[PDB]
Design a protein around this ligand. Sequence first.
Ligand SMILES: CCCCCCCC/C=C/CCCCCCCCOC(=O)[C@H](O)CO
Ligand SMILES: CCCCCCCC/C=C\CCCCCCCCOC(=O)[C@H](O)CO
Ligand SMILES: CCCCCCCC/C=C\CCCCCCCCOC(=O)[C@H](O)CO
Ligand code: DMA
Ligand code: DMA
Ligand SMILES: [Mg+2]
Length: 280
Amino acid sequence: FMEKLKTYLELIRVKNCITASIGGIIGYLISSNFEIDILKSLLVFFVVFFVCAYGNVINDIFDIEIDRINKPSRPLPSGKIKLNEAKKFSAILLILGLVLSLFINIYALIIAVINALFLYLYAKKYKKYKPIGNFIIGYLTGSVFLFGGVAGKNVMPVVILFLCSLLSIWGREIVKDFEDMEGDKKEGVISLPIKYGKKSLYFATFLVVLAVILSPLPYILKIFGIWYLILIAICDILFIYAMALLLKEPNKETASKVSKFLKIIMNIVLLAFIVGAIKL
Ligand SMILES: CCCCCCCC/C=C/CCCCCCCCOC(=O)[C@H](O)CO
Ligand SMILES: CCCCCCCC/C=C\CCCCCCCCOC(=O)[C@H](O)CO
Ligand SMILES: CCCCCCCC/C=C\CCCCCCCCOC(=O)[C@H](O)CO
Ligand code: DMA
Ligand code: DMA
Ligand SMILES: [Mg+2]
């Protein structure tokens, strides 16, 4: 049972879940202004943990045949865990997450249910269909924060963080798809750069631009101060510059570089929200 527990932790991808759970705490810290309550923290950490665990397991169930070719070392294609054992496990992880979220509030259950439907549908069909998949990737990453946010007293700064993450991650996903265009085409993957070419990069720019318009709101609404405003300013200008370069040079090389830059900037924006939250 020492080896079996290691196999079940490999199936859920325990590192990815803890990463998502920390994201959920981050959101709760901002919302409560670091005035953290241990009982609410334990609910937030584990609801995100089990909803994330369910998603990773449901992903492996629908990918058992695909994984048999690419990376057969995974728990399901290697035969370490039976398909039925995985299906019963994902059901248990799901009930745990949903029942636990009832003890937070109505908003937490709504996010829990919406995440659960998106995770199942993404694993089932929207992983291959990027126009909807790119939205899902954006929404789910942002929802992690919003989940911790709805548990705290001031959700407004976490609402802006969720909206900005969704828009910028969705945009960056189309940018990644423009770089992976040649590979995706010879795999039966439908994406905006495959259907529209360079035109899609204007929609990726639009999503980044809309995120930039919403970014000074915690300052304007008198929630966050000067350090947020300065960190956001550098990042907003760098975002508009990054997309401007890609629109001027719409190639695989530039798309690859802009994709790396946007990930760094997104991490500084997260730091700016944490820094802004330190109001004590
Ligand atoms: C990351 C790069 C950006 C550069 C950082 C810019 C931040 C500037 C912040 C200004 C506020 C000053 C806080 C320091 C108070 C310490 C002296 C207070 O005196 C003391 O040490 C007392 O004994 C404490 O009780
Ligand atoms: C591989 C080393 C890991 C050891 C973990 C350290 C434990 C420290 C804290 C308490 C353990 C959790 C509570 C016990 C749950 C089930 C006990 C019921 O007992 C058992 O699980 C059976 O005795 C197993 O045969
Ligand atoms: C590859 C992506 C990495 C970029 C991320 C930028 C982080 C933005 C946050 C603020 C940095 C604080 C400024 C202090 C550095 C000194 C300026 C020295 O800098 C300058 O004046 C010239 O830029 C030097 O060439
Ligand atoms: C960030 C994101 C899009 C979450 C979906 O989880 P997944 O099951 O697709 O993730 P992974 O491929 O890491 O198992
Ligand atoms: C404001 C903002 C975009 C938040 C941070 O996102 P992240 O660090 O989770 O981004 P990713 O992991 O998708 O690069
Ligand atoms: Mg991502």
